[PDB]
Curated annotation (Swiss-Prot):
Tissue expression per record: Expressed in pyramidal neurons in all cortical laminae of the visual cortex, in neurons of the substantia nigra pars compacta and caudate putamen (at protein level). Expressed in neutrophils (at protein level). Expressed in the brain. Expressed throughout the adult brain, but at a lower level than in heart and liver. Also expressed in placenta, lung, skeletal muscle, kidney and pancreas. In the brain, expressed in the cerebellum, cerebral cortex, medulla, spinal cord occipital pole, frontal lobe, temporal lobe and putamen. Expression is particularly high in brain dopaminoceptive areas.
Compartment(s) of residence: Cytoplasmic vesicle; Perikaryon; Golgi apparatus membrane; Cell projection, Axon
Disease link: Parkinson disease 8: A slowly progressive neurodegenerative disorder characterized by bradykinesia, rigidity, resting tremor, postural instability, neuronal loss in the substantia nigra, and the presence of neurofibrillary MAPT (tau)-positive and Lewy bodies in some patients.
Function noted in UniProt: Serine/threonine-protein kinase which phosphorylates a broad range of proteins involved in multiple processes such as neuronal plasticity, innate immunity, autophagy, and vesicle trafficking. Is a key regulator of RAB GTPases by regulating the GTP/GDP exchange and interaction partners of RABs through phosphorylation. Phosphorylates RAB3A, RAB3B, RAB3C, RAB3D, RAB5A, RAB5B, RAB5C, RAB8A, RAB8B, RAB10, RAB12, RAB29, RAB35, and RAB43. Regulates the RAB3IP-catalyzed GDP/GTP exchange for RAB8A through the phosphorylation of 'Thr-72' on RAB8A.
Residues annotated as transmembrane: none
Protein name according to UniProt: Leucine-rich repeat serine/threonine-protein kinase 2
Gene expressing this chain: LRRK2
First and last residues shown, out of full length: 12 to 127 of 2527
Post-translational modifications: Ubiquitinated by TRIM1; undergoes 'Lys-48'-linked polyubiquitination leading to proteasomal degradation.
Organism name: Homo sapiens
Highest taxon above the source species: Eukaryota
Record's subunit section: Homodimer. Homotetramer; when activated by GTP-bound RAB29. Interacts with PRKN, PRDX3, and TPCN2. Interacts with VPS35. Interacts (via N-terminus) with RAB29; this interaction is direct and stimulates kinase activity. Interacts (via ROC domain) with SEC16A. Interacts with APP; interaction promotes phosphorylation of 'Thr-743' of APP. Interacts with MAPT. Interacts with RAB8A, RAB10, and RAB12. Interacts (via N-terminus) with RAB32.
Free-text comment on this protein's domains from its UniProt entry: The seven-bladed WD repeat region is critical for synaptic vesicle trafficking and mediates interaction with multiple vesicle-associated presynaptic proteins. It also mediates homodimerization and regulates kinase activity. The COR domain mediates homodimerization; it also mediates homotetramerization via interaction with the protein kinase domain.
Family: Belongs to the protein kinase superfamily. TKL Ser/Thr protein kinase family.
Length: 100
């Protein structure tokens, strides 16, 4: 539950198994329970470095990561508020490093 969310934060605090942790995170993401992902630590701060460092050349994680990112921007209402005010530098990096 939420313990798995902070534990995934703790595992991802330190790429293949990272993709699996993010995958189970996406499995909780696509669920439609409640206002569950209201922590927004990842989604604003924890998701980003693995989104850029652990996806440098990657889309082993960059695919599922940016997918989870968009699903999270759709899910969490405060995700945009945590965004509106760097993700903008990050998305161009992911696009430029992946032309094909």
């Amino acid at each position: 539950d939420e313990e798995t969310l902070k534990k995934l934060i703790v595992r991802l605090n330190n790429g293949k198994q990272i993709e699996t942790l993010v995958q189970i995170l996406e499995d909780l993401l696509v669920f439609t329970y409640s206002e569950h992902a209201s922590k927004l630590f990842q989604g604003k701060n924890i998701h980003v470095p693995l989104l850029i460092v652990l996806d440098s050349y990657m889309a082993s994680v960059q695919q599922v990561g940016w997918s989870l990112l968009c699903k999270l921007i759709e899910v969490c209402p405060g995700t945009m508020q945590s965004l509106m005010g760097g993700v903008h530098q990050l998305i161009l990096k992911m696009l430029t490093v992946h032309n094909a």
